[PDB]
Amino acid sequence: LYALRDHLDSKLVPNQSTDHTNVLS
Amino acid sequence: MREVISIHVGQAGIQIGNACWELFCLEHGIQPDGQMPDAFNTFFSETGAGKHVPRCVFLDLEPTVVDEVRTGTYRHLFHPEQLISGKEDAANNFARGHYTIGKEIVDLSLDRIRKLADNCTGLQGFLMFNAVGGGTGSGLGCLLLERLSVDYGKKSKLNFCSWPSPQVSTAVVEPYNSVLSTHSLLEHTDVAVMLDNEAIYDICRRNLDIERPTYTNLNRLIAQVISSLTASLRFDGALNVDVTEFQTNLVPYPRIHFMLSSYAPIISAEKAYHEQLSVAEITNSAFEPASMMAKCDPRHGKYMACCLMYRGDVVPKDVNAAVATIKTKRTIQFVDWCPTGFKCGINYQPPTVVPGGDLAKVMRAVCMISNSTAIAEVFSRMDHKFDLMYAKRAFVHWYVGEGMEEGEFSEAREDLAALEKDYEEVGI
Amino acid sequence: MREVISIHVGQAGIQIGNACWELFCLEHGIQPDGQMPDAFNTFFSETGAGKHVPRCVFLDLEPTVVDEVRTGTYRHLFHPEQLISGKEDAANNFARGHYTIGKEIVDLSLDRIRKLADNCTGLQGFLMFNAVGGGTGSGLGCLLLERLSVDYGKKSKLNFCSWPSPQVSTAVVEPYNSVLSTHSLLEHTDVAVMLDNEAIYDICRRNLDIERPTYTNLNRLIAQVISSLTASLRFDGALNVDVTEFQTNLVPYPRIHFMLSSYAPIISAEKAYHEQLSVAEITNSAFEPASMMAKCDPRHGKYMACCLMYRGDVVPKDVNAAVATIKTKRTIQFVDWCPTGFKCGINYQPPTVVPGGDLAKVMRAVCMISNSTAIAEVFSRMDHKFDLMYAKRAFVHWYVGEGMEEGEFSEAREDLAALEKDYEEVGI
Amino acid sequence: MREIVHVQGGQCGNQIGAKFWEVISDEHGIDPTGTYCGDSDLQLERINVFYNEATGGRFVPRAILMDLEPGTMDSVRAGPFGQLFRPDNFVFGQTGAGNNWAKGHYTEGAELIDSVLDVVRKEAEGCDCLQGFQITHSLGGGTGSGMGTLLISKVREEYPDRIMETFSVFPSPKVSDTVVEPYNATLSVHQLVENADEVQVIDNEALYDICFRTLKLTTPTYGDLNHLVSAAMSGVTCCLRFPGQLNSDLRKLAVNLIPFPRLHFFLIGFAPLTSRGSQQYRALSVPELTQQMFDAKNMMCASDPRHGRYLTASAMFRGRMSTKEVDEQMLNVQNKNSSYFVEWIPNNMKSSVCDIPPKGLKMSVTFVGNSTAIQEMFKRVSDQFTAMFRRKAFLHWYTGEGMDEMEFTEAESNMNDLVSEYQQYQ
Amino acid sequence: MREIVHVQGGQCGNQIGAKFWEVISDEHGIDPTGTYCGDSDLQLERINVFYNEATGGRFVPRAILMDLEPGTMDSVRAGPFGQLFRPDNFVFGQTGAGNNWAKGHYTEGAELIDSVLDVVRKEAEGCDCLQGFQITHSLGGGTGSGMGTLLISKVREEYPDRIMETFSVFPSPKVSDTVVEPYNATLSVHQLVENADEVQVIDNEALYDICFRTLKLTTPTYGDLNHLVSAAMSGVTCCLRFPGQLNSDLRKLAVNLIPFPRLHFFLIGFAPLTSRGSQQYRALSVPELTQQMFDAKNMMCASDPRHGRYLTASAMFRGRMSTKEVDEQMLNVQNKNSSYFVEWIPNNMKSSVCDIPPKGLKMSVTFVGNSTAIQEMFKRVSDQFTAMFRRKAFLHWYTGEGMDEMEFTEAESNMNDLVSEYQQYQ
Ligand SMILES: Nc1nc2c(ncn2[C@@H]2O[C@H](COP(=O)(O)OP(=O)(O)OP(=O)(O)O)[C@@H](O)[C@H]2O)c(=O)[nH]1
Ligand SMILES: Nc1nc2c(ncn2[C@@H]2O[C@H](COP(=O)(O)OP(=O)(O)OP(=O)(O)O)[C@@H](O)[C@H]2O)c(=O)[nH]1
Ligand SMILES: Nc1nc2c(ncn2[C@@H]2O[C@H](COP(=O)(O)OP(=O)(O)O)[C@@H](O)[C@H]2O)c(=O)[nH]1
């Protein structure tokens, strides 16, 4: 039914789900 | 258990009809014979062994538009008995399309739609499609609407009428037809949407970089608006805004039920390459004061209640951000007795594009229907277009010559004046 | 994230931006289609799956150059609605570009820069490339500052002006356009520099040792000095300062915002061979009075504030050593009330070289913007040329009958003259 | 034992409670097919609080899906864990209460209220002695706020002494859909104050503040949005389903959080809440969790606690942790924020510890607070209401269904009296 | 225990903490991945001073890196060892205050200051009692000098009884960047003198002067100047975390170096600072390192101490030493260089021997000397201010955004009374 608006961007623990500089040494 | 009956009356009613059904057929994946190679139950039936017949009726007193689709490509797509061809045209007469030859054809129309209504219980409303500037589209549509109010008095009616334009006219007696029609349209339509033709013309200019097309994408652009409005009925969505709530959600008073509409993006392949189409700017272009299909500048108009259907890969979160910038920006004035006035209905399915058409494939699109006091200036230039035609009784001689009584035009003018003063007291 | 929008008024402004945007395409590695094979976000937006579009608008009244950009190889690099063209030339008239044939195109270009600005938050300002003597570059330039200043009242503006040059002028009525342009340029821009044409012509005559270049050879130098100015906004550096710091470090009074510019080195393939381009060498050469980009000798003037942008493999010690030797030198004179007149920003990413142009691959380079009291004689000769031309109505009759009254000419006279008295009173 | 019967109403409610059963079933060890895995007696010794044996070895939740739009529970069936509910608990709707409180309470409020009350009794007296009624619904929708509210009336008039609570969401201050928000909210809050033991307040964009600042989320979803309200929804009753050192009850909270019978609106928070940049270097200790109940950005409700004083706060800790710096951590937060607490109640804060942590974690806490911050939301819907009556609009289609002008006026005579008894106590 | 809460303001402050945290982490034996290695009790014996446990065994710095431009801490995070800090302690500005004192302090930075105040009291109150706050910044730019002293100003009021440790990088005399140097420097120093308990003066070309003349560095970058001051922070707080024969802390320095409260501006030397050609040629003992300490060529303030008298002096000795020679080697420098010390304080001294040196070295020293040599620096930033100010220089931005002419006049009165007091004590 295309549950994209319920597509989990979280896991079992609450949180969420997984998605230069030249240093002068 | 969930459906809508569509009625297409008038010459422009048929042409907006076959554009809507060519779009819905390729949207459902059904074929011009009726069968695929439960979303279809809101616009079609079953014809036995897996086929589908549309829930429509086509009505026109003049036959060359009805037999045109009877001979064309959607011959056996439609059931051949609601293609109600008349005998002779009303010839830009409200009076002829309502009094002389209407009574021999509304008996056939109401008997057909009686059988169309009883195919399923749980009907949601009606889809009127007509042009009000002409004779048989306005007159026979008004006659058929009055029978619908006295028979199905508890059901919504969703009129989609092509109101005449300030410049593009292609008739003469449009002030006579539209002023006479809109009184009996007012107390018999539950919910109605204005469409001025040249407003589609200029947004074809700036958004589609086409210089001058014909009526075919006049009607395809409007058909995408119809598809996006009823996609909450049809397809599964995140937040569904059905017709039975959309009727009672935008309309604040029993008489102010005339609304504008806009659609964004209507963008060709010229510039779909060049900008992203995300909610933060599609809503801005939808509220852009030259993008509606009515040519009613709302900068001196005054907003009251708006309805937005986001279709595609749309999250409510950037919807909330995009509507917040509409609220905070000063150029759009919402009325001082309605701070929040917004709908955000979300559908998962992206809008479909006709093959070989001038539209381009977009991820997301917003359909707008909004109530504003701007529309008082639309009906006031009908007042100025009509009052000096009626000043010394031009073209009335055959309006009354068929059997209509002089003086009902002037009480209709009292009804238009009652409508203008209503829009002034709303905004104050 | 953060972005800055460029605007290009006049043929000279669009041709400056033409070499600018082909240089930025090399710098960020994008092809002319816009699609790469996040440092580009200050000049390019996003589009689709990998395309970028510049935040630029190409505004002329003549279509012979704007349509020629559309027809050329950089067609789909720009969004087609960002290139706005008119109908007919201003034709070296400040009256036409500001009053008569400007009102139908300022409102259209304002819409395009509106839709280009609300895409993201974090804007620093605007970069307006324009000429002065041209009718379009002064006329639409004046009205664009007038509209952008009153609604974007807290955002910076960068008027890069191609001021008329001393020996050659290649125009007749251009002293009229220059005084009228500064009538409104003073109260509406934030940072402006003068880029005189024969100062640049002299640069490419004794640094490139080419004696008949073209317009594109100068526009490569202007592209290089804009790229070296805004390289802090794009590439990470040890000491980075950008548009906000320019508006607060180089313009100590609100009404002195006229600066010079220079670059170092500007060397050909054979001249890169025979010297190492040390930091101290490319600061002495940038501070050479013959190296300035406005025919504006600082030998008989006093420096007021200075800013240098070191790009490439520059080290933070010899930026201090080159500044120290400049302080010790007596030929360069400073102002008494500014003991610490030096600002700089160092960057790592060296200036790129166009393959087939005229520059050479350099390890390091210096950009320059310096405010001084030496622009007093630059505008005092625009005073003198305007005197004997405005003695007895030279070409005045077509500015006064075509949009303005007589008296705006006189008002522009004390507006530029009060800038001369402002330049005199600061030094003393 | 004692069993909580769950009623789930509205489009918003049927998605909230679906994630509620998606988070309770997988923390109790039940697969979506109904079987069990997890080989622990702690997950099974009290499973009758929410489930029922089906004499096939599976557990069917004691949930009642109820709605007047037939697409909402259509998505529940298609979704994951969508084969737990009995089809006989489902009651459908075809005419649809279209974002309309009036037609959802009376016109189609009659032919479905007889059936959803049939289904609740044979889920009620079929047990030995029930305990309470949890109801997830919305005050912004039409059938979530009207049709579910008539259910609140009919349950209490049969069962007048049992506890019941509503995890209700509220209309939005900033970005508002379903434009008759004060109409739906305030006609329902009269029935909420006279006919409900607890009402816990959730704001949609306050949850947006949770995912924006304390979660660092770019584009979260209703799955996550209902997940962080089902964490506290789990936490209010997990101490009932599980043992602990100092156990607790819904009525245990009720007696010592509600001071006086008409104010029972609660302020629900949950801790901890981490990002990728808030999980690795962060100590998970009780003094670190003390500040996350008393953090306005960690609040699921729009009411800013700094603009009020907590009448009575309570916390439901979970995990392997000592019970005492529950309480001197609640003592020093009371002592430093003395001006943030009411003065005429000594030792305002309640503490309780459950000996089962949330699954996958080591420690959490669910905050419930009766506070005088809540009047911010109660006065914006009040004066959004008063702008819709001095010119009579949008209610003529309420009067056409029976909702005449009489009851709207005392809907405000009890609403401003509700906030007057709030402010007269500070 | 005693804990330091570190705050870094500005691009200078974030880079100077992007070298100090490295030189203090490897002193504690901490990997960039936060895991300890080194099997020593003494490194972990006081790690709570500058770090907090994360309930994972890994230690997070108690720093708050903060300014108004995102390019500074993105380069810190991308650089080595920059992962140790929280993105929660990182606070972001997007528009940026560009070399502007006024809009850093009043308009822009005050918008950000209510959220970075949240993260600084969380690192403050999270322990039982803090020792003090260490704030490193520069007095030349906008965000590090204008709003950098705003947080110096406000931490005075809620935390008055605890010490205020600050490093400030003063403007350079002969070659200075950031054209408005004295407007940022003098308008910051008045808030920096009644809201900071002790301030250390570091000058940019004096760091260069140590590089070219004593280190013989052919190629010094900003990282080479940054090591010189990172060793100065490491020595001054070494005895807090690491034991010794004679203890010393921040208040130990404060009560012995300030006799009069309006003067707390300190000179810093660091020894040994060897050119590596003669590193293998130089003996390492107390009687050779003390005259490297008392030396103008080893001064990271560009003031010759021979143009003044040492009011008070101190030395944080470090290493396996002899704590007799800790003190007659500075007895020698007092009774020979008699004129270089003040007369009405007999016995101007404090040695503070700390047992554990930096790794490899057997001896090291940071030197804190409160002297009237800084008179030349305060006069020089004064006449550079007043030559500009007499002709209204670069000021219409400052006045137009929330300041006026009046505030700059007492900015020079409490600049000038610092010089007038140092001549009273001369
Ligand atoms: N949307 C739309 N409007 C049209 C089209 N063709 C004509 N119209 C408008 O319709 C108005 C008149 O109505 P008609 O299209 O002639 O149809 P009618 O009202 O039934 O009148 P008849 O010609 O007698 O059938 C004109 O003023 C046109 O502006 C069309 O193809 N699409
Ligand atoms: N540096 C530089 N200067 C140019 C260029 N093109 C034109 N100019 C200058 O512009 C002046 C001519 O006027 P234009 O700027 O072309 O006039 P305009 O802005 O197009 O205004 P209209 O001619 O009315 O359209 C000459 O004096 C040139 O110095 C160019 O490509 N580079
Ligand atoms: N948290 C949450 N809020 C929701 C959800 N669905 C809808 N809402 C909110 O509820 C309001 C609309 O209520 P609605 O679902 O139409 O109630 P209904 O009339 O009973 O269908 C909107 O303002 C949304 O913010 C959901 O799944 N989760």
Ligand SMILES: Nc1nc2c(ncn2[C@@H]2O[C@H](COP(=O)(O)OP(=O)(O)O)[C@@H](O)[C@H]2O)c(=O)[nH]1
């Ligand atoms: N010690 C040190 N000084 C620096 C560094 N970068 C710049 N400076 C000095 O500080 C001045 C610029 O200060 P800046 O960091 O821009 O201050 P801000 O604008 O407030 O962040 C320049 O004049 C430099 O001399 C650095 O990395 N380390």
Ligand SMILES: [Mg+2]
């Ligand atoms: Mg026709």
Ligand SMILES: [Mg+2]
């Ligand atoms: Mg031109």
